[PDB]
Design a protein around this nucleic acid. Structure first.
Ligand SMILES: [K+]
Ligand SMILES: [K+]
Ligand SMILES: [K+]
Ligand SMILES: [K+]
Ligand SMILES: [K+]
Ligand SMILES: [K+]
Ligand SMILES: [Mg+2]
Ligand SMILES: [Mg+2]
Ligand SMILES: [Mg+2]
Ligand SMILES: [Mg+2]
Ligand SMILES: [Mg+2]
Ligand SMILES: [Mg+2]
Ligand SMILES: [Mg+2]
Ligand SMILES: [Mg+2]
Ligand SMILES: [Mg+2]
Ligand SMILES: [Mg+2]
Ligand SMILES: [Mg+2]
Ligand SMILES: [Mg+2]
Ligand SMILES: [Mg+2]
Ligand SMILES: [Mg+2]
Ligand SMILES: [Mg+2]
Ligand SMILES: [Mg+2]
Ligand SMILES: [Mg+2]
Ligand SMILES: [Mg+2]
Ligand SMILES: [Mg+2]
Ligand SMILES: [Mg+2]
Ligand SMILES: [Mg+2]
Ligand SMILES: [Mg+2]
Lengths: 199, 132, 49, 88, 167, 565, 313, 101
RNA sequence: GACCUGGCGGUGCUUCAUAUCCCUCUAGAGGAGCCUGUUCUGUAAUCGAUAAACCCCGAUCAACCUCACCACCUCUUGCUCAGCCUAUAUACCGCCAUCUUCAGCAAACCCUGAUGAAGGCUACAAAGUAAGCGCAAGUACCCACGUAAAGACGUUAGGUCAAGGUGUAGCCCAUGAGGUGGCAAGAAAUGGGCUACAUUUUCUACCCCAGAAAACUACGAUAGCCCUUAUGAAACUUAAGGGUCGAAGGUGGAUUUAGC
RNA sequence: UUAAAUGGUAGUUUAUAAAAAAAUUUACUUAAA
């Protein structure tokens, strides 16, 4: 033991200036490091005539998912760098009514972000297609036949046809199937069969 | 009398940490959870596999760092990442710590097929919350 | 897969990279039993015949 | 980033279940556990594919441990070409 | 199974059986042996030498590589460790000669050393304490019944005339 | 985000006990971590079974075990190709021989691939996890035997054999094979020509003029064969021309001028070779001055990409030229180039990075205002490099020149934090500067506190186990610093150390001890000052004693003083 | 846990530096960063859901964290500073002495707003531990001092030990009277009974028509008792047949829904009656939310209160 | 290395059932209808009965993965009540707390 | 012989039990059928709990599997650097019952009894000061209410070697491992629950302004028999419905449970 | 101030405490014979 037991250096928070660039200290999400956070933050239910425990060796603070990497300064700086990637919403589509006129169909899909080694989620395949029958070129006969073919998929109050598809493994296959069903429904509604005279 | 995870009062000479001093009825009230993942949220899958992995990791780290851990692990999962936060003592030489961090991070990444990081916090001695 | 977990951590103990406190405990007890005179009998050469 | 956002808090879900107190017999005595699932819904509006891709990547990468996310994306589409007029 | 294994503390707590019903109302005191005392990190049965854990990281200014002790070298290490255990165990077996009092098993006439020094810079190194009687007195309590207490008479004196006793 | 100046590199564990505290610990801590990764990889590949359960989606190929053993056990040409892909030099040769003995046909391409494997590795197994000087090429090697065995030998076979010989320092044998290549009327490739250039210069020890003629002849051979030179062709020429101390400078510039005309863009390696050639230990450095200035003008604001293995060696050499020329503006231009874009990645290995920054910071302290030097000190240390003990001396000298000695106590603390607690040169320098002149009371108190800390470092020396060493200057300085701050009690103890260690006290220390005793008016103490100097037979003592006798001395003590001499 | 004064001084030194660091992190002015801004920042940076607020991360002025500790009571010579030191309660008995002295002098010369300082808060003032009987004795003198014609100085001394009870007013809060497109005055209120939640719109002028979910009240509530509950608020103030009500009720059963509407109508009708009538309504139980809700079943029992059959043998 | 022989017997049953699942599904489809002739449905009855007994999915038991306890297991975590409570009471299961209301 | 402490007293006095001791209040159990445990008896054929504090209890669960039982057959370095539901809960860890619908436990000191076991309060105060643990506070649920949770030290060598782990002892050609088939019944007694004995009822419509039924064709089986279907490889057996059948029961002794 | 018997045998109390270790050992490329 000619050199004595290695001594821990003093914490580097004592070298930090009060006007530092904090986003540089915590660039990404990292666990709470008491030697790097220059705050006398205490945590822990105090014992009688006691104070909340100090930050060094404090397992309660380690458990907290801290937001030291997302200080308001960092978020504003981050988004300034991310503006280059964004594209501008069409100004014409000011209101929801204007969106419906130009783009009658709405495709709903869902992505699930969970923690674990596998990203797979069987719920992500579901695709919902909604279209108002007033946006479709349907005559009187066709509209009546369509409403009968789809059944409960049609809502009279809203006049929206909801086609949910989840047969195929992938979302892209369910999207193609939903679009296909709308096509064959449209064309079958227009077709008039001889047995329809028995109505 | 209830027993679960209750350090029983002694002659006032036994040091206990903050985690060890709080009985199970204090979880979510005075102490938090030692593992954070989404398995146990409503509508989330694979709670069973997350549980087994946690039990293994706590044992692996106990044997790989024998006599070093001064408090329970804090397992964190963010997406694909696994982060092990360990409060260790300042007895083992730094060289041996760096070897074990590189070894444990690599071996566990290949075992659970995911990026694993180990964040060691060193304390001079066990942090005593109270003496029971 | 209890075969992988058990066999893996057994290998890690023989390599000196895992300390199995459980296995150390039952190893000392087996060593002390042998000295006390309690040892597993050889297969076939049992106390019975 | 110039995105229109509205936040509302859907009601929480508390799932409770009961277990036996003792390892053996003593049926009357139970331990009751729960898992509380709290929600927050961020409703974005009038985004383009590029804007949504960047915003989602930014907030998803910074999702705190123990928080799940379900992103429901409503895409505006035009009528399929085949549906413009009947073939019969 | 790996998952059924426990820590040493839980194992020793169960094996020692210090807490129980057989150790209460006077109803073998084996002692816990620390098995990690002589174990070094990186030492295994196979004998692999790991740069930076079991063996020095750099030898001759060159980072060592993974090596393995020869069959005969590992046998020496195991045999030496076994011998080092028999020595440590031997020390505990040794009985230190206690100076007996009036009788072999009697507490009377056994010195207790100097009285402990007082907090306000007071030292009592001149005085010699020696026990006179040790009695196991008993009372009866509603909850536990026979409750054992120790009554201890002692005498302290410096040898120059000062002398007292207390219970 | 930018580099955090208060933190050590990110690769290290951000913990006060685990953070590296010296330049060596930095290297060793990373080496230990890399060893841990190697041990894990060794286990993973030794026992793949335990790591074959794939639970990752999407699948991660990089996190799977690696299998290095040939899985085709049939004796065939197709099964042989596997062993060559696995880089099993011994297995491939043994199997190739067995294949040849069986009489089955091995394709020229397969035979050429085997030669590539043998020629590159010199018929020796590549290093594995677990199971310099001289010519590594050996006459009885498998490549030579197989090369002769070949029924048909194409241009590539000869090429790879020549390249192997040059790689393994068989320069004369490579040149002989090229002569055979020419006798067969076979065109050589660019890579063979680049190896042949190196062989010419290394093979014989002829004067520059002859070697230059030979090199030019190969270039004329290259043009005759319609072979277009690559960047490496010119970089080897310049690297080869470094051996000719003062005869290759102008020719080397001609080579550079030729590159630009052809269209080959000089990389960082090209300029590295030039500055190394032009910078020989000579005081004027007149030619070197012109070269570096012109090179830096050309390279200004150029983002570089990896082109030559020697690209990483430029920045360390460029900074070395700036330190020799003692031009700070040029150094700032070199550093500016490093910081543009992604050029910082060309700094090179650790020892390169330390050398570069040492020469850079040593030039700042000398040539720049103290206020800016201290900013560079804060930014670079410890975040960029751990300072050498001599750089702290240069920083102390810069502080002396600037008359900013209030920072000396801080430098000591930082020195202790960077592993210079027990460096004798640094400890002696600090004490001398603090005690050189008298200072105001507040500065004198601070210096006394630092002196006490340096004294504690001397008391707790690791060398103390070996022996007790207390330099005379250090002891004298510490004692004087205690006396000036008013800690006479502490100074009085140092007098025992002087005689104990046989260190002679300076007259200035003795002359100033008078006032301390006079202010106290304790004749006993006054004699102690006389008694000590008398032991050393200092001439000042005798003249001093008489003055003390006049001021304050007991009658009985006066008589004893004279007899003691 | 003995915190010396130098230690506390260093803790204050670290709070001021930390306070400036936190302002820099949050992009706020270091000079106007308050304690309420600190708490907001700490809550964001260190989000803790622990139900007990005393266990959450805190960054407060060390004077507010560390407990108030009494100063050294003797110098280096050893002579205690206070003449009543050896009593053991020098601060309590010093006060007791003063009040007795004042009372002697006063004799020789001759409440809803505020409560008597509680015991735990008097101990803090004195920084001494007291018994309940000690507190009673002290209060018994302070009261005696008020009974006598205490002078202006004595009144100030007493008021040191009198805190201020802010008395909650038991007065019903009246909803604003709004006007529809047609200019009819109406008030809207809310009620809740068990799981039923009803919104009632009471019109100032009407014929007595009550619509429940768009249905006439006698058709919606076929059970007479339910219709009796709807009558009670209006009958109590003699305003049957003078208002129209449009109420919507959801959840609960038939009785809970009738109870929720009763509370909603009563709260709304307070806008169109006199203050005195509002007080009578409050004293008849027409404006109180009934807290009686279904109690949960417990494990190991048959119901909320009922047990399983007990067998002695 | 499985907790006991009973767990080991269940491991083999889960493996054999997986191997035969497709064959068993196909044969059952022949049996579970009124379309196909009863003669063919009788032959399928015999064929499915001749498959190894341990392929029958009803023989699989959801045992505690840690202790092999066949009862008191929570299917979501695959743990017996005793093992689950041990991990829950130490705060090692994310989001599970004692329920009080 | 005389004491200390505790327990106990069909021991005194005073003050009281808040679903609580008595008198009172409401609905039950004890009687009938059936469901489901237990004890006995039975079977070649588990085990544990078994005053309060066992008895729809380990089981949020047994047709095979589960399984540990029985009969027969087979295997031997054995799924494991073996195994064992083999003995010992009177060796233990772990997790608990119980008093507890409690408020006490105790380190460190001081004093009293002449320095005995031991004892330590009086507020117009007479030797106690007490960290710590519990209660309390705080928190969860809808409040500051209530209800949960909490509940120390100890008592019953209380329950659990059969959750798992484990000390001691035992088996190792068997007390271990696998295969097939099989038993889990009712003379008798009893615990808990379910449905009823009806008119404050039965059926239908409706979810509250109705019409019928109403004593041997009424009320009343969730049993028996038969049939179909569901799950499964396997259903005399497990579950659902249909048909058929229309039974004891006519408000229940001593005794006994719960509820503010 | 009604009456209100019983509870197998033995077993329920004294000699001490605790390991120690060890370092790594300060600033390029390059080349020559
Ligand atoms: K008594
Ligand atoms: K009854
Ligand atoms: K056992
Ligand atoms: K056993
Ligand atoms: K019953
Ligand atoms: K006996
Ligand atoms: Mg309980
Ligand atoms: Mg003896
Ligand atoms: Mg089953
Ligand atoms: Mg009955
Ligand atoms: Mg039984
Ligand atoms: Mg029994
Ligand atoms: Mg069977
Ligand atoms: Mg069976
Ligand atoms: Mg058996
Ligand atoms: Mg017991
Ligand atoms: Mg409350
Ligand atoms: Mg309770
Ligand atoms: Mg409480
Ligand atoms: Mg017992
Ligand atoms: Mg028993
Ligand atoms: Mg057997
Ligand atoms: Mg009926
Ligand atoms: Mg029936
Ligand atoms: Mg069937
Ligand atoms: Mg009938
Ligand atoms: Mg008798
Ligand atoms: Mg008796």
């Amino acid at each position: 033991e000619r050199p004595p037991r290695r001594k821990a250096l003093p914490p580097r928070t004592e070298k930090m200036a009060v006007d530092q660039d904090w986003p540089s200290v915590y660039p990404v999400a990292a666990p709470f490091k008491p030697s790097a956070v220059p705050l006398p933050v205490r945590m822990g239910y105090p014992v009688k005539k006691g104070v909340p425990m100090a930050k060094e060796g404090n397992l309660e603070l380690l458990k907290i998912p801290n937001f030291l990497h997302l200080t308001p300064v960092a978020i504003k700086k981050h988004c300034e760098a991310l503006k280059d990637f964004c594209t501008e919403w069409p100004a014409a589509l000011d209101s929801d009514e204007k969106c419906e006129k130009h783009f009658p169909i709405e495709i709903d899909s869902t992505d699930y972000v969970s923690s674990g080694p596998s990203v797979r989620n069987p719920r992500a395949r579901v695709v919902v297609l909604r279209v108002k029958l007033s946006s479709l070129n349907l005559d009187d006969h066709a509209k009546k036949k369509l409403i009968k073919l789809v059944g409960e998929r049609y809502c009279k109050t809203t006049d929206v046809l909801t086609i949910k598809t989840d047969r195929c493994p992938l979302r892209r296959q369910n999207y193609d199937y939903a679009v296909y069903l709308l096509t064959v429904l449209y064309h079958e509604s227009w077709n008039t069969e001889e047995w329809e005279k028995s109505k | 009398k209830n027993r679960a995870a209750r350090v029983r009062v002694s002659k006032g000479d036994k040091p206990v940490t903050y985690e060890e001093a709080h009985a199970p009825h204090y979880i979510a009230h005075r102490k938090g959870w030692l593992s954070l993942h989404t398995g146990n949220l409503d509508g989330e899958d694979h709670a069973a596999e997350r549980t087994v992995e946690d039990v293994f990791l706590r044992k692996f780290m106990w044997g790989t760092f024998p006599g070093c851990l001064a408090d329970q692990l804090v397992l964190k999962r963010r997406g694909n990442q696994l982060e092990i936060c360990a409060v260790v003592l300042r007895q083992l030489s730094p060289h041996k710590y760096y070897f074990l961090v590189g070894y444990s991070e690599t071996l566990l990444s290949y075992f659970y097929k995911c990026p694993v990081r180990l964040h060691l916090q060193t304390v001079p001695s066990k942090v005593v919350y109270k003496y029971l | 897969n209890h075969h992988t977990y058990a066999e893996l951590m057994q290998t890690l103990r023989f390599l000196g990279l895992y300390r199995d406190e459980h296995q150390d405990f039952m190893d000392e007890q087996k060593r002390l039993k042998k000295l006390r005179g309690k040892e597993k009998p050889k297969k076939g050469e049992g106390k019975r015949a | 980033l110039g995105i229109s956002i509205k936040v509302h808090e859907p009601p929480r879900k508390i799932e409770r279940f009961t277990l036996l107190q003792s390892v053996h017999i003593y049926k009357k005595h139970r331990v009751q556990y729960e898992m509380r699932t709290l929600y927050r819904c961020l409703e974005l509006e009038h985004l383009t594919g590029s804007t949504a891709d960047v915003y989602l990547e930014y907030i998803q990468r910074n999702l705190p441990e123990g928080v799940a996310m379900e992103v429901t994306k409503t895409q505006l589409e035009q009528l399929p070409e085949h549906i413009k007029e009947p073939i019969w | 199974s790996f998952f059924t294994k426990l820590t040493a503390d839980e194992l020793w707590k169960g094996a020692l059986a210090e807490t129980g019903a057989g150790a209460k109302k006077g109803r073998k005191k084996k002692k816990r042996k620390d098995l990690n005392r002589g174990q070094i990190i990186g030492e295994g049965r196979y004998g692999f030498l790991w740069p930076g854990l079991n063996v020095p990281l750099m030898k001759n200014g060159a980072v060592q590589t993974i090596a393995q002790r020869s069959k005969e070298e590992q046998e020496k290490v195991e045999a030496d460790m076994i011998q080092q255990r028999e020595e440590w165990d031997r020390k505990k077996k040794m009985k230190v000669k206690r100076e007996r009092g009036w009788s072999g098993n009697s507490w009377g006439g056994i010195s207790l050393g100097p009285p402990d020094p007082g907090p306000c810079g007071e030292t009592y190194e001149d005085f010699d304490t020696r026990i006179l009687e040790v009695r196991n007195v008993f009372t009866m309590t509603a909850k536990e019944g026979r409750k054992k207490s120790i009554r201890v008479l002692v005498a302290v004196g410096n040898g120059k005339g000062a002398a007292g006793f207390s219970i | 985000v930018n580099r955090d100046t208060t933190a050590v590199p990110y690769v290290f564990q951000d913990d006060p006990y685990l953070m590296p505290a010296s330049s060596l610990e930095s290297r060793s801590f990373l080496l230990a971590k890399k060893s841990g990764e190697n041990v894990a990889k060794f286990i993973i590949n030794s026992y793949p079974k335990y790591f074959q359960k794939d639970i990752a989606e999407p699948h991660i190929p990089c996190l799977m075990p690696e299998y290095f053993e040939p899985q085709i056990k049939d004796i065939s040409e197709a099964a042989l190709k596997e062993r060559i892909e696995l880089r099993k030099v011994k297995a491939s040769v043994d199997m190739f021989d067995q294949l040849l003995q069986a009489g089955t046909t091995v394709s020229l391409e397969t035979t050429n691939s085997l030669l590539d494997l043998l020629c590159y590795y010199g018929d020796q197994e590549p290093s594995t996890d677990y199971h310099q000087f001289g010519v590594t090429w050996r006459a009885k090697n498998n490549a030579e035997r197989i090369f002769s065995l070949m029924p048909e030998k194409n241009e590539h076979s000869y090429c790879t054999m020549i390249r192997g010989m040059v790689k393994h320092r068989a320069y004369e044998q490579a040149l002989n094979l090229y002569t055979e290549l020419l006798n067969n009327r076979l065109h050589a490739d660019v890579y063979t020509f680049n190896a042949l250039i190196e062989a010419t210069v290394c093979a014989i020890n002829e004067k520059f003029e002859e070697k230059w003629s030979k090199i030019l002849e190969l270039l004329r051979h290259m043009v005759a064969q319609k072979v277009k030179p690559n960047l490496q062709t010119f970089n080897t020429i310049l690297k080869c021309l470094r051996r000719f101390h003062v005869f290759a400078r102008s020719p080397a510039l001609q080579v550079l001028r030729e590159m630009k005309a052809i269209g080959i863009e000089p990389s960082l390696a090209t300029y590295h070779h030039i500055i190394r050639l032009f910078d020989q230990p000579g005081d004027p450095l007149k030619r070197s001055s012109f070269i570096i200035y012109d090179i830096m003008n050309e390279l200004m604001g150029k983002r570089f990409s990896p082109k030559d293995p020697d690209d990483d060696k430029f920045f360390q050499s460029a900074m070395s030229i700036c330190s020799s020329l003692r031009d700070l503006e040029l150094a700032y231009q070199v550093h500016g180039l490093l910081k543009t874009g992604d050029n910082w990645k060309f700094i090179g290995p650790d020892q390169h990075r330390n050398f570069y920054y040492s020469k850079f910071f040593d030039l700042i302290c000398l040539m720049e205002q103290i206020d800016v030097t201290l900013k560079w000190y804060e930014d670079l240390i410890p975040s960029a490099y751990f300072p050498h003990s001599q750089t702290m001396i240069h920083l102390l000298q810069a502080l002396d020149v600037a008359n900013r000695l209030e920072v000396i106590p801080k430098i000591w603390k930082d020195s202790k934090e960077y592993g210079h607690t027990f460096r004798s040169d640094l400890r002696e320098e600090i004490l001398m500067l603090m005690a050189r002149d008298k200072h105001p009371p507040e500065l004198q108190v601070a210096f006394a506190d630092c002196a006490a800390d340096i004294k504690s470092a001397y008391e707790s020396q690791p060398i103390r186990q070996t022996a007790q060493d207390w330099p005379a200057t250090s002891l004298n300085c510490i004692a004087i610093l205690f006396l000036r701050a008013g800690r006479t009690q502490e100074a009085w103890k140092m007098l025992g150390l002087f005689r104990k260690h046989n260190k002679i006290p300076r007259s200035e220390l003795l002359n100033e001890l008078m006032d301390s005793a006079k202010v106290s008016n304790s004749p006993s103490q006054a004699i102690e000052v006389v008694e000590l100097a008398s032991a050393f037979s200092l001439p000042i003592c005798e003249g001093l004693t008489q003055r003390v006798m006049s001021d304050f001395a007991i009658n009985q003590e006066q008589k004893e003083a004279l007899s003691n001499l | 846990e003995t915190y010396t004064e130098d230690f506390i001084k260093k803790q204050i030194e670290e709070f001021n530096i930390g306070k400036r660091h936190l302002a820099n992190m949050m992009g706020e002015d270091p000079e106007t960063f308050t304690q309420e801004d600190i708490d907001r920042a700490i809550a964001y940076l260190f989000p803790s859901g622990l139900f007990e607020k005393r266990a959450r991360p805190v960054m407060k002025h060390p004077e507010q964290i560390f407990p108030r500790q009494r100063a050294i009571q003797w110098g280096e010579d050893g002579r205690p500073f206070h003449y009543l030191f050896y009593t053991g309660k020098q601060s309590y008995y010093s006060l007791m002495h003063d009040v007795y002295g004042m009372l002697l002098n006063l004799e020789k010369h001759q409440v809803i707003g505020s409560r008597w300082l509680i015991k735990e808060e008097l101990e803090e003032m004195l920084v001494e531990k007291l018994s309940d009987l000690d507190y009673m004795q002290f209060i018994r003198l302070l009261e005696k001092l008020l009974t006598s014609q205490c002078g202006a100085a004595e009144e100030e001394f007493v008021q040191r030990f009198r805190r201020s009870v802010t008395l909650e007013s038991k007065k019903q809060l009246i909803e604003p009277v709004q006007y529809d497109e047609q200019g009819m005055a109406f008030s809207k209120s809310e009620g809740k009974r068990k799981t039923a939640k009803a919104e009632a719109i009471v019109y100032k002028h009407g014929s007595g028509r009550i619509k429940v979910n768009g249905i006439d009240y006698q058709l919606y509530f076929p059970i007479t008792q339910d219709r009796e509950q709807l009558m009670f608020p209006f009958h109590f103030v003699d305003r049957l047949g003078k208002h129209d009500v449009t109420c919507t009720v959801s959840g609960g059963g038939r009785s809970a829904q009738a109870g929720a509407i009763r509370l909603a109508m009563a709260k709304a009708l307070c806008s169109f009656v006199t203050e005195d009538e509002v007080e009578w309504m409050r004293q008849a139980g027409l404006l109180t939310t009934d807290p009686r809700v279904r109690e949960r079943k417990k494990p190991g029992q048959e119901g909320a209160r009922r047990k399983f059959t007990w067998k002695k043998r | 290395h499985y907790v006991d022989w009973r767990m080991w017997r269940d491991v083999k049953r889960r493996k054999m059932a997986y191997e035969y699942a497709d064959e068993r599904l196909r044969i059952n489809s022949l049996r579970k209808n009124t379309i196909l002739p009863k003669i063919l449905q009788d032959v399928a009855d015999e064929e499915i009965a001749a498959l190894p007994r341990d392929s029958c999915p009803v023989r699989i038991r959801n045992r505690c993965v840690m202790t092999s306890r066949p009862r008191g297991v929570k299917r979501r975590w695959r743990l017996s009540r005793i093992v689950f409570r041990h991990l829950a009471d130490h705060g090692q299961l994310s989001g599970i707390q004692r329920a009080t209301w």
